[PDB]
Amino acid sequence: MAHSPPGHHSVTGRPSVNGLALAEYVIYRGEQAYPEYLITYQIMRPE
Amino acid sequence: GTILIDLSPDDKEFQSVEEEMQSTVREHRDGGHAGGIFNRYNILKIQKVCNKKLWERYTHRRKEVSEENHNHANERMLFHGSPFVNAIIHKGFDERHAYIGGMFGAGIYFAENSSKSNQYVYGIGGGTGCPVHKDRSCYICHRQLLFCRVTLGKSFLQFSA
Numbered sequence: 666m667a668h669s670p671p672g673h674h675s676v677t678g679r680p681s682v683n684g685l686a687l688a689e690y691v692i693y694r695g696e697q698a699y700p701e702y703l704i705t706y707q708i709m710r711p712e
Numbered sequence: 713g714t715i716l717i718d719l720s721p722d723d724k725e726f727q728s729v730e731e732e733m734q735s736t737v738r739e740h741r742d743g744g745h746a747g748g749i750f751n752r753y754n755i756l757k758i759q760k761v762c763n764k765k766l767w768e769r770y771t772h773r774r775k776e777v778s779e780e781n782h783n784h785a786n787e788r789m790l791f792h793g794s795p796f797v798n799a800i801i802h803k804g805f806d807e808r809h810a811y812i813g814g815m816f817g818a819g820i821y822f823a824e825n826s827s828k829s830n831q832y833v834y835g836i837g838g839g840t841g842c843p844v845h846k847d848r849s850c851y852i853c854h855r856q857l858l859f860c861r862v863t864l865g866k867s868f869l870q871f872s873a
């Protein structure tokens with residue numbers, strides 16, 4: 666695992682081309698996330 | 713130490729998690745190549761993940777971050793898709809769940825868009841798709857995502873394509 670930028674605890678990847686995309690985020694320590702919900706699903710074929 | 717508690721679909725907690733799942737689907741620039749072609753999901757089950765040790769590990773670290781950032785953990789709920797979700801719920805996130813080749817360096821990646829994390833359920837780029845049918849757009853096989861509590865603290869802002 667890499668280190669976060671000096672002075673920071675994570676990275677935010679802000680989209681700057683695709684206007685409909687939401688943000689993505691990166692952490693560099695496992696202890697900064699807790700897996701709260703497990704969701705079981707299928708993708709649905711469009712009609 | 714992990715136990716999984718099923719939520720009832722009548723539970724407002726099930727409903728708010730389902731809504732985050734459904735309302736954050738978008739179209740992807742690969743035309744569905746990685747994650748499949750779909751506009752919504754059939755949600756089959758939602759379970760709360762309970763592990764005391766992993767929770768206390770998280771809150772310990774959250775307090776450290778918070779105290780380094782004017783008492784602000786900057787905590788979010790975000791999606792994570794991985795072939796290793798069974799290991800993650802039992803042993804926690806660690807270095808072995810890093811995206812070594814990710815655009816922001818080797819760390820653990822999370823998405824606001826559920827459909828973005830869905831592209832990783834069978835591996836980077838969707839791998840070879842589902843184990844049973846080798847189909848990245850499989851409509852039959854059951855998929856799993858995590859909806860996770862993530863401490864961002866002071867986040868470095870990368871504008872990017």
Ligand SMILES: O=C(O)c1ccc(-c2cc(=O)c3ccccc3o2)cc1
Nearest residue numbers: 689792793794811821822823829832
């Ligand atoms: O096993 C791996 O190498 C592995 C690599 C990446 C992910 C992953 C999982 C995600 O949910 C995700 C979200 C936004 C951007 C990238 C993302 O990547 C999950 C696993």
Ligand SMILES: [Zn+2]
Nearest residue numbers: 842845850853
């Ligand atoms: Zn399949």
